[PDB]
Structure 1
Amino acid sequence: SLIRNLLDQASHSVGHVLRMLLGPWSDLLLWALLLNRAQMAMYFWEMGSNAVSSALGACLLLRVMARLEPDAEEAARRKDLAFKFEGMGVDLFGECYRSSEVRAARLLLRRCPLWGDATCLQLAMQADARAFFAQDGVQSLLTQKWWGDMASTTPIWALVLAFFCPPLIYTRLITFRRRCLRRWFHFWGAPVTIFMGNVVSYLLFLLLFSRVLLVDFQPAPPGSLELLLYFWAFTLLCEELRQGLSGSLSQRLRLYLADSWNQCDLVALTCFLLGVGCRLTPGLYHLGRTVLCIDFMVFTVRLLHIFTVNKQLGPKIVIVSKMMKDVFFFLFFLGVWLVAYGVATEGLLRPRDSDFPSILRRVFYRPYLQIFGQIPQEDMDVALMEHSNCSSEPGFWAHPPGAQAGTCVSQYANWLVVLLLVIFLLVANILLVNLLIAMFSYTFGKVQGNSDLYWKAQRYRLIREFHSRPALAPPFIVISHLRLLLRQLCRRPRHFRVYLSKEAERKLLTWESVHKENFLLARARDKRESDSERLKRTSQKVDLALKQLGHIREY
């Protein structure tokens, strides 16, 4: 199995868990989980302490072991145990939140001594406990943390007005949980305010980049505006580099190459560096301008991910991410039909200007544009063209008026050319677009129910990442960077983690144990009231009656 060999390898030497494990109920529970004893795990859980934290840790280790399983059956057993176990854990935490909201809220951030001193939230995220993030209790607590010391009942427009007018903080609007200085730091350190500052800074960055690209990008040496834009770009590069380094050196970069949004930011920044180099070098000014235009497109795309936090939009964004397979199949089919129809028409009518770019244009671009209402009838039908004799080759040609429709086409089979145009319009503009409608509707209907749950996890990760992000905006985050490097240089000569009281820890443990035993007795009553169990009981009672009646049959 994966227990004896794992212990032998650890002795011969998740890795921290293996190191700490070697050959009060925590040890029994962990042994039950590693031995794949489902009933032992359940019972040790239910009669042991720290049920929620133990549940998150144990389901994390179940997922890890199922991934490590070389046997599909054992992996399936471990993973189904993990699903049932995370579900029952989240049910317990839901019934806990149903009792005392603030008690459960401070139960979350409780740094439990076991499982590597990691909070429940980090354990769930490492375990991919989407269901354990789904419940309204943890959702509301995450919302309040995103509104850290801001009384989340405040509306968004109040927040934007307060951001625009710093004096507005000391008003009746926007309540909150050196008083002026403390309020100032709370306002400017709240993760939601950090997010708003980042959004406004990014909008200003895009506006300035567009202004530079459309007006101030002459081949003259860079001006003050160009230098300032370069300064913002370098600051963003430093920001992303530090974020990747913080969130072991090579292991961290291998971790960072994931999270495709960071990949998009990285490729955008590399394109920016290439564009700056080409702009600075004399010869490649035009190439620099083109690549910077492409980079603007990439940055505008990244703005979407920056604006995925909205409660009504994130599921839709992950939906449109999921719809790529359907659009991609449609791309194949459209390409095939476009090749067929374009080559057919390019063979039926033979323009004199047979240059390769012109042939490729007439075979791909124009048929593609026929889909969206651009139909050059005067270019590809003879009855709309004036007849003339071009070449010595025997035929009737009727030179067109179009600039890139050819010098003059042939006309032997224009009836079948028009027939092909009709067929192509019927297939591409009717069969394909409406069939893509069908696939899009079906995919949305199937996927939305899991997309919203994935958005819950994504929003938790978003809250964590903006909490980890420093205070000042990217245009001024150079101050934060120099502050952190000074802190790095200060030690050379030398995550919410809300504190809980020591007696409060014991009171939370007792409260959680009491509510756990209440939930178990409730579920036991439910199982007893279940019709199948009742029929079981009736069957046994009837059997006992029959047996004891047989014991008096001799009378």
Structure 2
Amino acid sequence: EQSWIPKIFKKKTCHTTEKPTDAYGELDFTGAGRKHSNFLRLSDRTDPAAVYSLVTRTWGFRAPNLVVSVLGGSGGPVLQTWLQDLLRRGLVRAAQSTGAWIVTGGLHTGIGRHVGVAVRDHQMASTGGTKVVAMGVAPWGVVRNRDTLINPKGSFPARYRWRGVQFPLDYNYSAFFLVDDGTHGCLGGENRFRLRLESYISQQKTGVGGTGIDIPVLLLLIDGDEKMLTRIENATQAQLPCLLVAGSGGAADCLAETLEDTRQGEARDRIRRFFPKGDLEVLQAQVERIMTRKELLTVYSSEDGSEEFETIVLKALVKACGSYLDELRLAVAWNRVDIAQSELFRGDIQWRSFHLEASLMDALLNDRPEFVRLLISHGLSLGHFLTPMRLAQLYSAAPSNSLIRNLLDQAPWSDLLLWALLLNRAQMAMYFWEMGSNAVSSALGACLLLRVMARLEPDAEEAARRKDLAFKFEGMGVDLFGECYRSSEVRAARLLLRRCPLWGDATCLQLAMQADARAFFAQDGVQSLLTQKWWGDMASTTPIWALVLAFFCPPLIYTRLITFRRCLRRWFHFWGAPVTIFMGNVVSYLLFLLLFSRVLLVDFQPAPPGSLELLLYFWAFTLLCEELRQGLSGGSLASGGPGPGHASLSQRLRLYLADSWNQCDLVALTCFLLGVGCRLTPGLYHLGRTVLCIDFMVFTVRLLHIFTVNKQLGPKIVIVSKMMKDVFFFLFFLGVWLVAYGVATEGLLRPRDSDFPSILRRVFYRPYLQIFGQIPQEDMDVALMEHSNCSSEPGFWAHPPGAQAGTCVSQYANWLVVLLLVIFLLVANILLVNLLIAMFSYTFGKVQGNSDLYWKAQRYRLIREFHSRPALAPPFIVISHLRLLLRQALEHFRVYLSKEAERKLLTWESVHKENFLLARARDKRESDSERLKRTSQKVDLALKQLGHIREYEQRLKVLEREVQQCSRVLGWVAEAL
């Protein structure tokens, strides 16, 4: 695998030399575990920046937040029980709450064996995730079995054997640094590597960018021995780390007594420690070098036990700093919320503004969404916070390298909302939308921007998040509009249609259209607005017959029947509505078909053409012109199309030829041109008629695409195209079963008059008309024909009475023909047709629910097409094109309001939004599964408070017994002596 490890890191032998390093790789214990632990042999006096870069970069460890270092020696008996409680409650629960490390002498049977027991017990007790990591620094020279690790290329698994002064390696850790100095069995022979590593960690920033704090580090000592004071004084003189001294040990309680003062030093150095030591420098150096400063040391409380440990750590680590680190930035660097809870809600110290204003910047970068609610709820106003230098700094952080970094390689709340939407943070984005201003338009725009940016990234793990976040925004927008349509439908109609300035001159509905949001058109209020849009200017659900009677006679609109200086505006309002230009288009098209039929049936003689064909040619030229206008005027940004504004001719040409109906009309026009050019040349008169009669069919079948808009045929026309998965199955099965019957029948009868078309006819075409109730039996039997022998081959022959069935049919074994007829009719008639009915029913009942939604989506585009179309008939399309080429959507697409009504309307909707979110939150709060959780927490609290009451009865009974004994003794000395 890697090979730079024996290139950089060195080792030493038996005043010594330097060589490349062997014996490295992963290590495996044949036990219950989820990973193989890493180890490395390395030489002393190496720059620890390299080994820190090794641990962070190559191996999969995350950069730490807190480095504690257990540093003591008990000598190896079993410890008393409350020390086990301390290491089992305080240095493991805190160490997996925050992502932390534990640096320990990594051998077995040392102080670290108890640490391993505590880690193992806490993993075996419960599973809360994020298993406790630990490194082990140990000297090469006391490990029991060598020669199963050392190999010059290296072993990636390594089986390890305990049985087969030395020590084994413990099996609880995840990293093994083996320092070497050159010896065999010198315990306690490497410390300066450990001190320089511990010191190098505390000058390195945390987080992604270098913004926040330096990593805190602390040395925790329970009882040691007579040389541990040197280890204390080296660190606390050199690098200023905060210390912590566990009370009631046996070699650090001397420091507790000499710090609790604020010669007796000889009284202390022989009472709370090993009395044979030699009072020569221990009283002077190994106490005075420690007690020359006291802002660093801290006595841990012996009367106050566990469940307060990180509070004591936090207080000591703040206190020793002032010999700028604060409390909130350290809390945000961890993930604990309750520390911020107590610090904010506690009324002992009034909080300033600079602390919050600085710490919010560190909260936004490392994606801690639960803290921003606290830091902005009872804190600062954001108008003080957001400054353009700060926002430039926030954009300046780029946490990834491929999404916004690649899109910048080419280069107040909504400003944060775009920032949250670019970098894929869900729990930030919901909060910034909920504290937003323009409610409904922002949701659909967010859905649009996610659907666009989902394409450019390569992976699928990103797309499975982007599509889900887009569905979440679309659903939230749908429910918000549904909770506003309930009251004052005029207000909702005014809200939906208007223009939102934050994204340019675009409306809400067009943004919903270009992102393909089905569920937003799915609901009913949008449908009821599109209905009134489609009835045009000033009509309301007048029936159809009034419209037809108005369109037939123009002096009936000035009267009572229509329902809504004066007349010349009334006449312009009536013909502007789309439901009238639709009727005009349909009437013109039917007149075109009737004229074409009267040309084809009676006329179209071999002659010079005349007026009744020149009218048709003029008509076809106008239809080609209108098709060219629709094509050139110009699709869907959700696919990745070129979008509005300007695009290429090579883009619009590719766009236009993908929708099938215009492709069919183009084919129809070219076939029409082929026929009408065929005719003008002489000598090919018949072929023009033959082509043009077929092309009439393709002109006629387009009369279904026009009626897609209407209400009662809309969801019915679309389903017919999705039922083409079964007609092909029917044709396959029937063709295979049909050809065999045809060949077998014409083999048994043997007609003695044969050609190619007669045989092809009598094999295919005659069985095909037998499944539709036409069964002629004249050519099948012989017992209906005349026994006539006119044939020359030997046998017996019969004469058919019909036509096309030859003139001679054999009679040998004629009953097989009748039996095959019965078999074929029973198969095709009784099984296949009924099976096809069953398949249509089962396909329809499934696909109906999707087809209805897809029809509801496209109705807006089909309405929008008709308004841009010219308002005159194809007999007046020359004058409409004259008005178009004389100077070379507005209705129900922009409503302009007064700004006081705008400012009122946004308040009206913001009230409903703030009501809606609170209603949903309280409905989740008062459910029937969170009652159980709060009762669980309250019963746990009650049990914990009940745990204090028990010992008071024991101590109070003991004290009352002592008072009774003292009263008995005083009464004895008074009245008994």
Any idea what the Cα deviations from partners look like across 1:141-160, whole Å, max 9, x if unmatched?
Answer: 11111111132321122111
Per the alignment, do residues 333 and 50 of structure 1 end up closer, same or farther by CA in structure 2, a change over 3 Å counting?
A: farther
> Equivalent residue of 1:67, what SS?
coil
Question: Helix, strand or coil: the match of 2:500?
Answer: coil
Among residues 404, 409, 417, which one is paired with 1:3 in the alignment?
Answer: 404
TM-superposed deviation, 1:131? 1.4
How far apart are 1:434 and its partner, in Å?
Answer: 1.0
8 Å contact 2:800–2:806 — kept in the other structure?
yes
Kindly state the Cα deviation for residue 350 of structure 1 after the two structures are TM-superposed: 2.5
Instruction: Please say if residues 143 and 152 of structure 1, whose CA atoms lie closer than 8 Å, have aligned partners that are also in contact.
Output: no
- 1:27-59 per-residue CA deviation (whole Å, 9 max, x = no partner) reads 332332332222222222222122221111111
Q: CA deviation at 1:270?
A: 1.9
Aligned 8 A contact 2:539 2:563 in 1: yes
Q: CA deviation at 1:221?
A: 2.5
Q: What secondary structure does 2:779 align onto? A: helix
For the 8 Å contact 1:379–1:405, the answer to whether it is kept is: yes
Deviates more, 1:436-445 or 1:540-549: 540-549
* Residues 255-264 or 162-171, more deviating: 255-264
In the alignment, structure 1 residue 549 sits paired with structure 2 residue 949: no
**Greater alpha carbon shift after TM alignment, 381-390 vs 321-330:** 381-390
1:173-229 CA distance string (max 9 Å, x none): 2222x3212221221121111111111111111122122222222232223222112
Whether the aligned pair in 2 keeps the contact of 1:387 and 1:398 (CA below 8 Å) is: yes
Shift of 1:552: 4.5
Query: Which position in structure 2 is the counterpart of 1:122?
Result: 510
Q: Is the 8 A contact 2:786 2:799 kept in 1?
A: yes
Change (3 A) 1:376 1:193: same
Moved more, 196-205 or 98-107: 98-107
Q: Deviations over 1:234-270 (max 9, x none)?
A: 111111110110x932322221112222222222222
CA offsets per residue over residues 468-524 of structure 1, 9 Å max, x none? 211012222222122111121xxxxx9722323333333332222222222212222
Alpha-carbon contact 2:622-2:877 (below 8 Å) kept: yes
Over the residues paired in the alignment, what is the CA RMSD in angstroms?
2.6
Q: Quick one: structure 1 residues 215 and 76, their matched pair in 2 at CA, closer, same or farther if it must change by over 3 Å?
A: farther
Change (3 A) 1:533 1:416: farther
Out of 501-510 and 101-110, give the one that drifted further. 501-510
* CA–CA distance in structure 2, aligned partners of residues 512 and 174 of structure 1: 36
Distance 1:352 1:155, change over 3 A: same
Q: Distance in 1 between matches of 2:738 and 2:454?
A: 47
Give the C-alpha shift of residue 551 in structure 1: 4.9
Shift of the 383–477 alpha-carbon distance from structure 1 to 2, 3 Å rule, reads: same
Report the Cα offset of residue 318 of structure 1.
0.8
| 1:276-318 alpha-carbon deviations (Å, 9 max, x no partner) | 2223232333222222222221222111111122212111111
1:553 Cα shift?
Answer: 5.3
C-alpha distance in structure 1 between counterparts of 2:883 and 2:742, whole Å: 62
1:105/1:436 Cα in 2 relative to 1: closer, same or farther (>3 Å)?
same
Show CA shifts across 1:429-452 (max 9, x none).
221111111111111111111211
Are the structure 2 counterparts of residues 183 and 78 from structure 1 closer, same or farther at C-alpha, using a change threshold of 3 Å? same
Q: Which residue of 2 aligns with 1:180?
A: 567
CA shift for structure 1 position 68: 4.2
Q: Secondary structure, in 3 states, of the residue corresponding to 1:283?
A: coil
Which shows bigger deviation, 461-470 or 383-392? Answer: 383-392
Identify if the C-alpha distance between structure 1 residues 364 and 99 changes in structure 2 by more than 3 Å, giving closer, same or farther.
Answer: same
Q: Look up the SS of the partner of 2:477 in the other structure.
A: helix
CA change 1:287–1:47 in 2 (3 A) is farther
Distance 1:531 1:3, change over 3 A: farther
Shift of the 362–35 alpha-carbon distance from structure 1 to 2, 3 Å rule, reads farther
Distance in 2, matches of 1:275 and 1:548, equals 99
Go from structure 1 to structure 2 and tell me whether the alpha carbon gap of 1:236 and 1:547 turns closer, same or farther (over 3 Å shift).
Answer: farther
- SS of 2:408's equivalent in the other structure is helix
Does the 8 Å CA contact 1:341/1:424 hold for their aligned counterparts? yes
- CA pair 449-403 structure 1, distance change in 2 beyond 3 A: same
* Structure whose residues are more often strand by fraction: 2
- Are 2:474 and 1:77 aligned? no
Contact 1:150 1:174 in 2 (8 A): no
Could you tell me whether the CA contact under 8 Å between 1:65 and 1:75 is conserved in 2? no
Cα 1:398–1:248 change in 2 (3 A) is same
Contact 2:537 2:576 in 1 (8 A): no
TM-score by length of 2: 0.52
Q: 1:193 to 1:421 in 2, by over 3 A?
A: same
SS of the residue aligned with 1:68?
A: coil
Does the CA contact (< 8 Å) of 2:533 and 2:892 recur in 1? no
The CA distance in 1 between the partners of 2:427 and 2:804, in whole Å, is 77
Residues 321-369 of structure 1: CA deviation (Å, up to 9, x unaligned): 1111122222222222222322332333322343222222222222221
Does the 8 Å CA contact 2:791/2:808 hold for their aligned counterparts? no
Choose 35-44 or 384-393, whichever is displaced more: 384-393
* 382 and 223 in structure 1: CA distance in 2 versus 1, 3 angstrom threshold: farther
Note the alpha carbon deviations across 1:370-391, whole angstroms, 9 max, x for none: 1111222213333333333354
- For the Cα contact (< 8 Å) 1:53–1:120, is it kept in 2? yes
- For the structure 1 residues 85 and 336, does the alpha-carbon distance in structure 2 shift closer, same or farther, using more than 3 Å as the test? farther
User: How many residues end up aligned between the 2 structures?
Assistant: 535
Instruction: Verify the 8 A CA contact 1:66 1:76 in the aligned structure 2.
Output: no
Q: Which secondary structure state, in structure 2, belongs to the residue aligned with residue 496 of structure 1?
A: coil
1:5 positional shift? 2.5
Q: Kindly indicate whether the alpha-carbon contact (under 8 Å) linking 1:134 and 1:456 is maintained by their aligned counterparts in 2.
A: yes
Aligned CA distance change for structure 1 residues 233 and 48 (closer, same or farther; 3 Å): same
Once the two structures are TM-superposed, the CA of residue 67 in structure 1 deviates from its matched residue by 4.1
- Indicate how the Cα distance of structure 1 residues 168 and 87 shifts in structure 2: closer, same or farther if over 3 A, else same: same
Q: Distance in 1 between matches of 2:583 and 2:680?
A: 34
* Deviation of the 1:420 alpha carbon: 2.2
Residue 242 (str. 1) matches residue 622 (str. 2): no
SS state at 1:258 partner: coil
Match of 1:296 among 691, 696, 716: 696
Give the TM-score of the pair, scaled to structure 1. Answer: 0.90
Pair 1:506-2:876 in alignment: no
1:61 and 2:449 matched: yes
SS at match of 2:575: helix
State the match for 2:578 in structure 1: 191
Quick check: 410-419 or 86-95, which moved more? 410-419
Q: 1:401 to 1:73 in 2, by over 3 A?
A: farther
Cα distance change, pair 173–407 in 1 and its aligned pair in 2 (3 A):
same
Q: Which moved more, 1:224-233 or 1:67-76?
A: 67-76
CA contact (8 A) 1:353 1:406 kept: yes
* C-alpha separation in 2, matches of 1:342 and 1:433: 20
> Higher relative contact order at CA 8 Å, sep ≥6: structure 1 or structure 2?
1
1:408, CA displacement in angstroms? 3.4
Say which SS state the counterpart of residue 404 (structure 1) adopts: coil
* CA separation of 1:180 and 1:403: change in aligned 2, threshold 3 A: same
Paired residue for 1:284?
Answer: 684
Q: Which moved more, 1:79-88 or 1:68-77?
A: 68-77
1:15-164 to 2 correspondences below 5 Å: 24-164=412-552
Q: Is the 8 A contact 1:130 1:457 kept in 2?
A: yes
Distance in 1, Cα, partners of 2:430 & 2:615: 62
| Pairwise CA distance, 1:69 | 4.5
Q: Using the alignment, how far apart are the partners of 1:344 and 1:535 within structure 2? A: 79
Which has the larger displacement, 422-431 or 401-410? 401-410
Structure 1: distance between partners of 2:899 and 2:558: 36
- Distance (whole Å) between structure 2 residues aligned to residue 545 and residue 275 of structure 1: 96
Contact 2:679 2:685 (C-alpha < 8 Å) held by counterparts: yes
1-structure distance, mates of 2:534, 2:443: 25
Q: What is the DSSP-based 3-state SS (H/G/I as helix, E as strand, rest coil) of the residue aligned with 1:435?
A: helix
**TM-aligned CA deviation for residue 554 of structure 1:** 4.7
More helix per residue: 1
Q: Per the alignment, do residues 345 and 97 of structure 1 end up closer, same or farther by CA in structure 2, a change over 3 Å counting? A: same
CA 1:210–1:531: 2 relative to 1, 3 Å: farther
1:405 Cα offset (Å): 3.1
Percent identity, aligned pairs only, is 100
